[PDB]
C-alpha cells in the first residue's frame, strides 16, 4: 500500500433489485473471483510478508 500509487475503489449496488420466486426465501449469495489480464506486469522480486518463522524446522 502506497498513496501516491493508489488504484481506486470497487463498489456494487442494486440496479433494480433481487426478486425471489414464490416458495423461496432468505439470502442468496454471489461468489467473486480475481485474476490478472494479459496486460499485467510484475517486477523487482522481493520477500513476502506472508510467511516467517522463529526456529528452523526439523523432521
Amino acid at each position: 500500500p502506497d498513496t501516491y500509487t493508489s488504484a481506486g475503489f470497487l463498489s456494487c449496488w442494486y440496479q433494480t433489485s433481487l426478486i425471489l420466486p414464490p416458495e423461496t426465501t432468505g439470502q442468496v449469495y454471489l461468489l467473486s473471483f480475481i485474476s490478472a489480464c494479459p496486460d499485467f506486469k510484475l517486477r523487482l522480486m522481493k520477500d513476502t510478508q506472508t510467511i516467517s518463522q522463529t526456529v528452523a524446522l526439523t523432521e
Binding site: 442494486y14 440496479q15 433494480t16 433489485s17 420466486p21 414464490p22
Partner: protein, 255 residues
C-alpha cells in the same frame, strides 16, 4: 447462438448487458450522427467531448406499484446534472445530442404487468387549468426526478391525466411514436436509440427539451401471492454524438 434477447451496449467507460431484451428501436430508423456542414449555420467550430459526455447515466429509481399511473422525463433536462454532460450544457449557448435510453424492470415468471416505453418528439404539455393557462418552466424541467403522473395537479404545472398523454391525445395512439413494451412475461428491458430531431440544426439545451421519454404501466402489475406488491423501474440514458457550441459564461435558469 446470438439471440435478439442478449445484448451489450458499451459507450464510453460504461457498459450495459441485458439477457432478456426484445430487439431495440432506432427512432425513424435513423442512428444519431454529427451535424454536417451543409446543414450548419452558426460559424463556430463545435466541441465534441466524446467519451466524457457519451457514457451511461443511471437516473434514480422509480417504484411500480399497483397504483402507478406512469412517469415522464424530458431530454436533455433529465441529464442537466450528470457529470460533464451537464456542465457543458450550462456553459455553451447551443448544443445537440442523440441518446441511447435503456429502461430496466425485472420480475419473475409468476408476475404479470406490461409497461409502454415511448419517446415523443416535441411533447408540448397541457395546463390542467384549460383555457390558455401556460405551464411554468420549472414544471417542465423536473430534472432527474421527472414528472410523476400520479402526483397531484400543482399550480402552473401540466395536467397529469394518462388516458390523454398530457396533451389532448389518447394513450392508445402513442404507438405511432418509436416505442417498445416491457411485458414481464417476455422482456425485462426496453432500448431506444434517439437521433437528434429538430427544425433547426442546433438549439439551446435549456429553453427547449426535444423529447420526453415516458414509461406507463398499461397492464397493471400483478405479483404472485404474498409477494411484495411492487417492482423498481430504473432508467439509464447515454448522450451520443454530443456537440456543444458557443461557449461563454454559464447560463442561470429559473429555480
Amino acid at each position: 447462438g446470438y439471440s435478439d434477447r442478449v445484448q451489450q451496449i458499451t459507450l464510453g467507460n460504461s457498459t450495459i448487458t441485458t439477457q432478456e431484451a426484445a430487439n431495440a428501436v432506432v427512432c425513424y430508423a435513423e442512428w444519431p450522427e454529427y451535424l454536417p456542414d451543409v446543414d450548419a449555420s452558426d460559424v463556430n467550430k463545435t466541441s465534441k467531448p466524446d467519451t466524457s459526455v457519451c457514457r451511461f447515466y443511471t437516473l434514480d429509481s422509480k417504484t411500480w406499484t399497483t397504483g402507478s399511473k406512469g412517469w415522464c422525463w424530458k431530454l436533455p433536462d433529465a441529464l442537466k446534472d450528470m457529470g460533464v454532460f451537464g456542465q457543458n450544457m450550462f456553459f455553451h449557448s447551443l448544443g445537440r445530442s442523440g441518446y441511447t435510453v435503456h429502461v430496466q424492470c425485472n420480475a419473475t415468471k409468476f408476475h404479470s404487468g406490461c409497461l409502454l416505453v415511448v419517446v415523443i418528439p416535441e411533447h408540448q404539455l397541457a395546463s390542467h387549468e384549460g383555457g390558455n393557462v401556460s405551464v411554468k418552466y420549472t414544471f417542465t424541467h423536473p430534472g432527474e426526478r421527472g414528472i410523476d403522473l400520479s402526483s397531484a395537479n400543482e399550480v402552473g404545472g401540466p395536467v397529469k391525466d394518462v388516458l390523454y398523454n398530457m396533451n389532448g391525445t389518447l394513450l392508445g395512439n402513442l404507438l405511432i411514436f418509436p416505442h417498445q413494451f416491457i411485458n414481464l412475461r417476455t422482456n425485462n428491458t426496453a432500448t431506444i436509440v434517439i437521433p437528434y430531431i429538430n427544425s433547426v440544426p442546433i438549439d439551446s439545451m435549456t429553453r427547449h427539451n426535444n423529447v420526453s421519454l415516458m414509461v406507463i404501466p398499461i397492464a397493471p402489475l400483478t405479483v404472485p401471492t404474498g409477494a411484495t406488491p411492487s417492482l423498481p423501474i430504473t432508467v439509464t440514458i447515454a448522450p451520443m454524438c454530443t456537440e456543444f457550441s458557443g461557449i461563454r459564461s454559464k447560463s442561470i435558469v429559473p429555480q
